[PDB]
Amino acid sequence: ELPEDPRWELPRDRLVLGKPLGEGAFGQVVLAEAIGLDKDKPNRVTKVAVKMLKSDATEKDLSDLISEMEMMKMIGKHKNIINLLGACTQDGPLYVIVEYASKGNLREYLQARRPPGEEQLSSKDLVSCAYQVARGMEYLASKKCIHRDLAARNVLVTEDNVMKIADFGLARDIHHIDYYKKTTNGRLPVKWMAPEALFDRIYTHQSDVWSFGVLLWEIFTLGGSPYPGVPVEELFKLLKEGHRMDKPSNCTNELYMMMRDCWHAVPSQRPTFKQLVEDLDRIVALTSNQE
Ligand SMILES: COc1cc(OC)cc(N(CCNC(C)C)c2ccc3ncc(-c4cnn(C)c4)nc3c2)c1
């Protein structure tokens, strides 16, 4: 069965399962309340998210969920990632307990804050979003983690507006990706892939920087859809031609230069996440919150 790990084990009777938050093919996430998740106070409840298998899950799906939990244990904690908090592994179904991000994914967060046809985001708020995501990615890269699907849909937002990278440990067989498979919202994930990842199946920290450039474009378009109406075969042609997305409106030349630099054709020439954090820290400090 599953091996005991006292560093992370939470007794099942401490976890009160709640409403669904999200679902995949053979995995599901629910909101829950953990009683005494911390050794002191044992009388406090914490809202958490719990990932578990679907009822039609196979041995391979269980292996995949364990692999993701094990990677999260190894990577350790950071403010700008969804952190592992505990697990229920004994005498019942596997529950992987992680931080809850009440405001949901970044794509929906941005779209809900567009001016009418919560409150509007300032230019400083948008650059701060980009900075926090770059900080989470710099941490993951420092821990030898390659995300492989960095996009606003995979960034969650907490109640205190903290950006947290999600699904960085997700089991993924890159030789069995269906390029035609659309996301829940009807978009194609290939549109965030670096050309070397898409054409040659080569995933690196450099290919995650390319994806971060697409994510910057999503931020400054307030959750815009990259290449709307472009099918897989036409996207391949655009990438082969060296096509680059246009500058969004209300985006500085400097932040557009940053997107373009993330999209360098030569992977070695793209900025690193360390470089992006430093530049975004400087830009945040110089960006007005007055509009
Ligand atoms: C490392 O990141 C992980 C690890 C993990 O288990 C090991 C599960 C999650 N998930 C699934 C994440 N999938 C998507 C595709 C990004 C969470 C985690 C915390 C969550 N908090 C809030 C909400 C929420 C709020 N509003 N709405 C509509 C949904 N959804 C959550 C989903 C994230």
Residue numbers in the entry: 464 to 580, 592 to 765
What do the authors report?
Importantly, aberrant FGF/FGFR signaling has been linked to several developmental syndromes and a broad range of human malignancies. The involvement in the pathology of many cancer types provides a strong rationale for development of effective agents for these targets; consequently, there is a large ongoing effort to develop FGFR inhibitors as anticancer treatments. A number of crystal structures of FGFR KD in non-phosphorylated and phosphorylated forms have been reported.
For the FGFR-selective inhibitor JNJ42756493 there is much less reported information despite its promise for clinical use. To help rationalize functional differences between these compounds we generated the structure of FGFR1 in complex with JNJ42756493 by soaking the compound into preformed crystals of FGFR1 KD in which there are two molecules of FGFR1 in the crystallographic asymmetric unit. The quinoxaline core of JNJ42756493 is observed to form a single hydrogen bond to the hinge region via the main chain amide of A564 while the dimethoxyphenyl ring is orientated perpendicular to the quinoxaline core and occupies the hydrophobic pocket located behind the gatekeeper residue (V561). One of the methoxy oxygen atoms is involved in a hydrogen bond with the backbone nitrogen atom of the DFG aspartate (D641). The methyl pyrazole solubilizing group extends away from the hinge region towards the solvent channel and does not make any specific interactions with the protein. A structural comparison of various drug compounds (JNJ42756493, BGJ-398, AZD4547, TKI258 and AP24534) bound to FGFR1 KD clearly indicates that a unique feature of JNJ42756493 is the amide side chain which extends into the region of the binding site normally occupied by the a-phosphate of ATP where it forms a hydrogen bond to the side chain of D641. In addition the terminal isopropyl group of this side chain also makes good van der Waals interactions with the protein in a shallow pocket formed by the side chains of N628, L630, A640 and D641 that has previously been referred to as the “pit” region. The side chain modification to JNJ42756493 therefore likely makes a significant contribution to its overall binding strength and specificity. Combined with several recent structural studies of inhibitory compounds bound to FGFR KDs, our crystal structure of the JNJ42756493/FGFR1 KD complex provides a detailed picture of common features and key differences in the extent and nature of their binding interactions.
